[PDB]
Each structure stands twice: as structure tokens, then as C-alpha cells.
Amino acid sequence: KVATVQ
Amino acid sequence: SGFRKMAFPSGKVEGCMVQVTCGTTTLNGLWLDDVVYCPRHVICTSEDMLNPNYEDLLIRKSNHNFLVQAGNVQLRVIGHSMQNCVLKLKVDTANPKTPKYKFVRIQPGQTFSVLACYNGSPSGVYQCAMRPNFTIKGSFLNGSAGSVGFNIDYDCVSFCYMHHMELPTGVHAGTDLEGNFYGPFVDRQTAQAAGTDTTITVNVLAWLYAAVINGDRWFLNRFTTTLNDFNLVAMKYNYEPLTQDHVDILGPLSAQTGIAVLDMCASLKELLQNGMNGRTILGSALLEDEFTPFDVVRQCSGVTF
Amino acid sequence: SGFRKMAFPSGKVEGCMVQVTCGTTTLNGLWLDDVVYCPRHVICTSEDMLNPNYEDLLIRKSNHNFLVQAGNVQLRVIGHSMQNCVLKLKVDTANPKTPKYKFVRIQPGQTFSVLACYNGSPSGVYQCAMRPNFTIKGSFLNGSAGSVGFNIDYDCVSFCYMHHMELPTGVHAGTDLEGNFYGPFVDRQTAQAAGTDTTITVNVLAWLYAAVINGDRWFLNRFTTTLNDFNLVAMKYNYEPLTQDHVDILGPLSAQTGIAVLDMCASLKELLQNGMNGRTILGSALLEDEFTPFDVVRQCSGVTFQ
């Protein structure tokens, strides 16, 4: 799973 | 009496929260004097996140491409630059509600208040801690980027964190207000991983002093210990190495309660081995470590702002 | 993602906090329009507190006896009167920072945010729940009386709690903003004590749903039960009884997670009878009961497939 810029 | 995870009053920060829009992407900005600080991935889209070239993406943007709204009042952007991972939008109006403010970069183990905002509207405030791996166990949904973390001293707000991302493990990463990430993370939607996380030993000790101060005392013993005989167990349970600096910072609490640091240390050692065996401390069966020594003094002495 | 005890932003309330001093006693007051609200025992001396006669004590006070301060600026008191255990001091200036507000009386289990204050200035803000025994497990020191609890819906503040006193066990008691205490307590120095406290069942259930949404699901069992059955069980464990309104309020979380309200009730059973076995849930070794369902829905924004 990848990071999520919020 | 009583001890709660207490956040700072957020009134001074609420008056700085604005909205920053760029095409289809909205997030939060911080309006101090005539500059609005915000994460730079507002210039990104939902397809420009794998490996975004921020330098190039910004080139294609002008002042008018940045929609900055304080409430329903649009702020005229007269300038824009990029400093590390943050964006500085120069506006034509200085924020009338600008408080006394500084920018600081906190160290792992220190705490701060998060004002969680969406669409530039504050929605909640809670206390967090810069974990040793440079992440934070926060509560953030999409649109929360640009939310800031902060401490207060007298009337000066110290901004220390701006929110950018959520890592794959559900934890969160961000920058100081200069745009330098805490920890080795980057604002791209890749597989990045946080290191191993230890417990903030000096903070747990302060937490015990707050327990004693409040009448929780089943855990104190008569045995005392050495610093190194203690760290041997600390490094055994993924606990930060306690330094003399830490013992010194705990001086004012030892003096107030009378318990030497090393005695409370020994009390922790047996709690670490034998455990709590049913009983709670300040309403918790776990050893809380998100309270600094100053966090305890502020709450227990009624420091105001 | 992530789940945290969260207070409402206190800015709207900070602009209403003031300081009220009567003789040697100082506490906090709430400045709404041209009225300051504060606990009435500000007019009491330590001797008076043994058996206070507030009507008599108040009639003996003049407007001049009440020093009301917004920071360092003094507010001229032009009238005073009493409404149950709260004093209402009319001043010559309306509060320009008055928000849209209402006074609500909240019910056990419901949560609110407390802005702890001293001398009219704020110290911190935290999240509380009215306990079933009509106490709150707050963080209050001498001078904190007059601090308020609140909720913010829209841009309207729902003032529900004003602080008064601390019970001998370290918990706290107070009134709604019309001066009526929560619980059996009175504002006099008497042997008073809170009843045996029950656990807010509907909140623990919401907390369990929250745990599911965030990944933690080990505790999920493969059983169901009836409402009357579970209620009898929660009674042996000093858990509050679950009403049908509780199951309706948990509906959204049930549909989101796909786990029925009565299936979770059965999971909650296994936990009460066999315990946790050294296992944590959302980073806690105890069933948290001060998260309402509405709180969970605000921090977990999941999709309901139909």
C-alpha cells in the first residue's frame, strides 16, 4: 500500500 | 484533581485557518501576516501523485491559479514561492487576527496540539506527540492537509507541524512550517515505511508523577535502582534510553512529589516486568507516554493563556 | 484514518470567558450578550459553605460587590439575580464576541468539550462524557468553577455544563446553564458522594465499530443474541441498558461495517466474560466508553454499499 497525500 | 489528555486553547489558531484551492484539489492554509502557508501538493491532482515534479508543476501556475478564501472573503494572491515541501502565497492583506507567533522544529518525544481542519474550517483539536520514528498517531481524513500542530506560551503560538500525508500503516507525516518533513518521508504516493517505534521513557515517568500528584500510588515501591540497571530493562521493552538530561528535566516534578527519579524508575521497572495486574493508573491500564514533564506542570498547576 | 479523543475548537467559547470576583473568592463566568453567568457559590465565604442560605447572601450583595473582568477590562455590573445554582450578572456592555448559542441539558452518555479556565483565561480543552451517575471525569483545580462544557453544531455553541465542585473520589459535578445540577448533588459543604458508576453501553459499542473500521477486528465473534438477553448480561457487569434508540443510532455504523448491532452485542459479551487476554483494541486495554456513535462517524467516514 502507498502513502496518501491528504 | 484529575488528569486528561489536554490540548491547548485553539482560539488563536482558528483565526488563521484559510482554504487553498487549485483546480480540483482543496486543502488548508495558514494565514499569518500577508503570507498563506500550505502544503505544495495543492498544485497536484489525483493523477499527478506517483512521482510529481513539483518544480515543473509550479512553473505552470501563476498567482491567479491560487484560490485563497478566508471564510467567504477571497484573498488576492500577489506572489508565490516554494520552500521545501510547503508553498508560501503572498497575499495583499495582512491577517488582522494574526497572533504572536514563532516557527519551531520539535524533537521526537515532544507534544503539541493538532487543529484538524477541512475546507479551511476548524473541526477538532487534540494533543499528539512526535513519535521517535518521526510520525504521529493522528486522526486525519482527506482534505486535512495543511492542518497545523502547535504549542502556546503566554500569548505566543509556536507552530511546529503542518500535515501532509498518511503513511500506509495509518500513521501520519508532515513538515515544520519551513517545509522540511519530520523523518525520511516525501510527499509522493509511494510505498514508504516508518521505522520501529520506541516508547518515550521520560514522558512515562512524568505521567507517573502526575499519577502520584493525583493520588494514584499503588505502584510506588521502596526499592531504588541505578540509571544503567534501568536502561537494561528499558532497551528490553523498546523504551528510549533515559539520559541525565531526562533526569534533570524531571527535577521539578521529583522535588514537588519528593520521589527521586531513580525510585520512580524502579517502580517503572517492575510495572514493565510484573505489570499492572488489573489496577489502572489515571484511568488507564497502559503506560501513557504522550505527556511531557512540562505537560504535567501546565495541567497540574493551572497554567493559562 | 486514525482515531483520537477530539475536542471542539474552543475559540468561540474563549471569547466568552470572563473572571468574576466576590470579596475573596474568584471563579470564571460566561459572558453572553449583556449577561455573565457563573456559579452562585462565588458569593460564599468558607464559613458560609457549611449551610449556605444563598437567597440571604445574595440580597446582602450590591452590584458593586461583583467585580467582573474581561482580561483586565472591568465590566460595570448593573443588575444581579439568581437562577437555581447560577448567578446572572447584567452588565452595561453586550459581548461583541457572543456566538450563536443555546443552553441544552444533556443526558448521561453524551459527550462534550470542556475549556478548563482560571481567572477567565483558558488553560486547556479536553473531551468529556456525562457519566451515568451524573458526574464527569474531568481535570479541574481550585478556581476552575465557572468553566463550561459545550458542543458546536454548525456555528452554534450548545452550552451544556458549568463546573462547580469536586467529589471526594476525584470526579466533578456541575449544572446546566440554567443552574440545575446534574445528579443529586447540592452546592454546600456536606458529605456528598457519587453513586456507583455504570459503563455507557452504547458508547462502548460505537468504540467497537470504530475498532473494526480501523483494521482491529480480532475480537469479532460469530454469534448473535437478543436485546433483552444482552441487557441482562450487561446488568451483571454494571453496563448501562441498551434501548431501541441506541440500536437506531448505531445503525449507520452497523450498515457501514456490515455487522449487525446484535452481533456486536454478542462480541461485547465474549469480551466481558473472558476478557482481553493481553490483547489491545485501538491501543487500549480497556473498553473505552466516552466515544459516542456520532463521534465515531465523524472520524471514520466509510462507505455503505447497498
Numbering used by the authors:
A (entry chain C): -6 to -1
B (entry chain A): 1 to 305
C (entry chain B): 1 to 306
Relevant lines from the article:
The SARS-CoV-2 translates its genome into polyproteins that must be cleaved to release individual proteins essential for replication of the virus. Given that Mpro processes the majority of these sites, any intervention that stops this process, such as an inhibitor, would block viral growth. The crystal structures of inactive SARS-CoV-2 Mpro, with the catalytic Cys145 mutated to Ala, with 9 substrate and 6 product complexes were determined to sub-2.5 Å resolution. As in previous apo and inhibitor-bound crystal structures, Mpro crystallized as a homodimer.
Six additional cocrystal structures of Mpro bound to the product (cleaved N-terminal side of the substrate peptide) were also determined and comparatively analyzed. Our cocrystal structures captured the N-terminal product after the cleavage reaction was complete where no covalent bond exists with the catalytic cysteine. The N-terminal products carboxyl terminus is coordinated by the catalytic dyad. All 6 cleaved substrates bound at the N-terminal side of the active site superimposed very well, defining a “product envelope”. There were no major rearrangements or shifts in the backbone and except minor side chain conformers, the products bound similarly to the noncleaved substrates. Overall, the product envelope recapitulated the consensus volume revealed by the substrate envelope for the N-terminal part of the Mpro active site.
